[PDB]
Amino acid sequence: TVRKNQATLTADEKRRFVAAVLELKRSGRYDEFVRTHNEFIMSDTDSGERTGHRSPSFLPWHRRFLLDFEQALQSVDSSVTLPYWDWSADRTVRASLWAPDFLGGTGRSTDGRVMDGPFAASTGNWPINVRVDSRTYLRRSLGGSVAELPTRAEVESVLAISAYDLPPYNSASEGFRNHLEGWRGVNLHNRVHVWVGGQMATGVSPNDPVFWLHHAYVDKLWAEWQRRHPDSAYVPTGGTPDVVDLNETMKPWNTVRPADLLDHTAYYTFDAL
Amino acid sequence: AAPESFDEVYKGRRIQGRPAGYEVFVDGVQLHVMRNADGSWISVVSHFDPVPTPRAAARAAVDELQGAPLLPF
Numbered sequence: 362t363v364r365k366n367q368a369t370l371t372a373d374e375k376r377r378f379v380a381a382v383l384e385l386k387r388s389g390r391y392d393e394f395v396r397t398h399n400e401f402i403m404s405d406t407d408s409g410e411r412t413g414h415r416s417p418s419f420l421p422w423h424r425r426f427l428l429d430f431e432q433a434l435q436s437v438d439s440s441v442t443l444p445y446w447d448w449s450a451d452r453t454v455r456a457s458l459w460a461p462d463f464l465g466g467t468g469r470s471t472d473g474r475v476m477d478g479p480f481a482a483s484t485g486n487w488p489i490n491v492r493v494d495s496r497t498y499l500r501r502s503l504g505g506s507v508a509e510l511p512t513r514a515e516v517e518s519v520l521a522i523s524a525y526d527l528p529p530y531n532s533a534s535e536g537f538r539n540h541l542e543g544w545r546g547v548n549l550h551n552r553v554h555v556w557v558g559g560q561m562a563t564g565v566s567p568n569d570p571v572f573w574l575h576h577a578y579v580d581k582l583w584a585e586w587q588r589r590h591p592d593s594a595y596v597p598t599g600g601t602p603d604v605v606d607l608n609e610t611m612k613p614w615n616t617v618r619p620a621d622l623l624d625h626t627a628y629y630t631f632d633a634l
Numbered sequence: 635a636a637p638e639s640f641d642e643v644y645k646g647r648r649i650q651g652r653p654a655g656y657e658v659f660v661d662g663v664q665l666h667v668m669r670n671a672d673g674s675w676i677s678v679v680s681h682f683d684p685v686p687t688p689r690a691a692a693r694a695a696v697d698e699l700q701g702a703p704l705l706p707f
């Protein structure tokens with residue numbers, strides 16, 4: 362299983378990825394990923410139980426959630442793997458990611474509606490069902506709410522941070538995890554959600570297929586951090602109320618721990634690391 | 635200490651907030667909101683962009699909705 366930079370996919374690989382995503386949507390399986398994600402967005406709190414977000418398990422949790430989604434895609438087409446979007450490099454609306462043969466572009470100005478690509482509401486193939494905003498079409502406003510995606514220099518400043526995470530292990534933390542997540546500092550992952558806009562700015566952000574490509578690159582940055590800091594590892598390592606310690610199991614699966622997900626090569630490799 | 639309650643018409647939508655942590659409504663439909671450890675707020679329709687107060691989160695939700703009804707959670 363090799364996870365490839367989206368920019369490098371062949372036309373055939375793009376076609377197969379899109380078709381597998383559309384089939385998960387048609388069959389009803391896609392929307393339950395969106396629902397699970399929103400449940401954790403709403404339940405993870407700074408002062409209470411926190412598992413998928415704003416906590417050290419943000420990274421292993423999304424790594425397992427993406428593995429569940431990739432496995433679902435492979436159950437439709439076994440050749441498909443999740444690509445990643447390096448938003449530090451492919452940083453404009455003219456990027457091939459946003460072309461009509463891949464994810465389609467930005468939303469029109471009046472209502473945010475995406476008007477092209479395979480996920481445009483006009484196709485009839487991408488109903489927005491799990492939603493809070495009652496509108497049922499994919500929406501985006503690329504670069505609308507924040508002017509720029511993060512740069513390679515900003516990403517490197519975060520990869521340089523030695524500590525994986527720090528008490529109090531929430532949105533107030535110093536350390537790598539919270540700077541990558543983006544609640545403190547120059548802001549990597551949260552800012553990309555804000556930059557895409559539309560459903561990507563919400564708790565139902567997996568409604569946009571770019572969600573998976575964004576998180577596949579956040580996941581790659583975790584792998585890059587590990588190679589820069591082989592001496593540094595996940596924390597905390599036991600006994601922390603409300604936080605998933607290294608060897609504790611994680612909801613919703615309950616059968617996996619951060620420890621089981623630190624080494625991605627158990628599951629996939631990257632085109633380059 | 636919880637923020638004060640509020641009630642206003644913002645961009646033609648009635649927004650209300652009240653301590654409960656804290657509940658927000660847009661035309662009577664409850665909107666999930668959350669407080670961050672540094673005292674900023676977010677909502678489920680603007681989760682990744684902290685704003686200073688629950689009223690600011692309600693107003694960001696009305697801006698996001700562009701006139702559309704909110705659905706309950």
Ligand SMILES: [O-][O-]
Nearest residue numbers: 414554566576
């Ligand atoms: O966090 O998506």
Ligand SMILES: [Cu+2]
Nearest residue numbers: 398413414423
């Ligand atoms: Cu998430």
Ligand SMILES: [Cu+2]
Nearest residue numbers: 403404666667
């Ligand atoms: Cu709640």
Ligand SMILES: [Cu+2]
Nearest residue numbers: 550554566576
């Ligand atoms: Cu995310």
